[PDB]
C-alpha cells in the first residue's frame, strides 16, 4: 500500500481498501460515525461557508495555515484581484506602465493612460 491512503490512522490492505478504526468512515477514514447526542450538538459550517472570499473569488478546501493557525482553505482570485481573501484590487499602476511621464489610472485587471503633450499612444509610448 502506497504509504498511507487512509487518514485518521485506518489500516490499508490492497487497488486499495482501508480498515476504519472505531469512529471513522469512507472516504479513506475521513468521515463521521455518531450516536443520539451527536445530533443536537452544534454543527459548524465549513471554512468556505459563509464564503470568506471577496470580489468573486472561489473558496477551496486546502491544507492551509495562516501563521500557526490551520485555516483549511484558500481563495482563488479572479484576474485583477489578490490577497488572502481577494480583497485587494491589484494596483496595475505600481509597475508604471505609462511611459514618458504619462499618468496611470487603475481599472479592474487593466489601467489607462493620460499622456503629457506630444506623447501619445495607449501607453504614451509615441512622441
Ligand atoms: C483593458 O485591458 C485589456 C486586456 O489587456 C486591453 O486589451 C484593453 O486595451 C484595456 N482597455 C482599455 C483601457 O482600452
Ligand atoms: C450546522 O450549523 C449551522 C449554523 O446555524 C446550521 O444550523 C446548519 O443547519 C447545521 N448543519 C446541518 C446539519 O444542516
Ligand atoms: C472559482 O474561481 C474563481 C476565480 C472564479 O472563477 C469563480 O467564478 C469560480 O467559481
Ligand atoms: Ca486594478
From Swiss-Prot:
Disulfide bonds join 1-12, 6-18, 20-29, 48-59, 53-75, 77-86, 93-104, 98-113, 115-124. Residues 1-30, 44-87, 89-125 form the EGF-like domain. Ca(2+) binds at residues 89-90, 92, 106-107. Glycans are attached at residues 43, 58, 110. It is found in: Secreted. A motif (Cell attachment site) lies at residues 66-68. Promotes adhesion of endothelial cells through interaction with the alpha-v/beta-3 integrin receptor. Inhibits formation of vascular-like structures. May be involved in regulation of vascular morphogenesis of remodeling in embryonic development. EGF2 and EGF3 form a rigid rod via an interdomain calcium ion binding site, while the long linker between EGF1 and EGF2 lends considerable flexibility to EGF1. This is EGF-like repeat and discoidin I-like domain-containing protein 3. The lineage of its organism: Eukaryota, Metazoa, Chordata, Craniata, Vertebrata.
Amino acid at each position: 500500500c502506497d504509504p498511507n491512503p487512509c487518514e485518521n490512522g485506518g489500516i490499508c490492505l490492497p487497488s486499495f481498501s482501508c480498515e476504519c478504526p472505531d469512529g471513522f468512515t469512507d472516504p479513506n477514514c475521513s468521515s463521521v460515525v455518531e450516536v443520539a447526542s451527536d445530533e443536537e450538538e452544534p454543527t459548524s459550517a465549513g471554512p468556505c461557508t459563509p464564503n470568506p472570499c471577496h470580489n468573486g473569488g472561489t473558496c477551496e478546501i486546502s491544507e492551509a495555515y495562516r501563521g500557526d493557525t490551520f485555516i483549511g482553505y484558500v481563495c482563488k482570485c479572479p484576474r485583477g484581484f489578490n490577497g488572502i481573501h481577494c480583497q485587494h484590487n491589484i494596483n496595475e499602476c505600481e509597475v508604471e506602465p505609462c511611459k514618458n511621464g504619462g499618468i496611470c489610472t487603475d481599472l479592474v485587471a487593466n489601467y489607462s493612460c493620460e499622456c503629457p503633450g506630444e506623447f501619445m499612444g495607449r501607453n504614451c509610448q509615441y512622441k
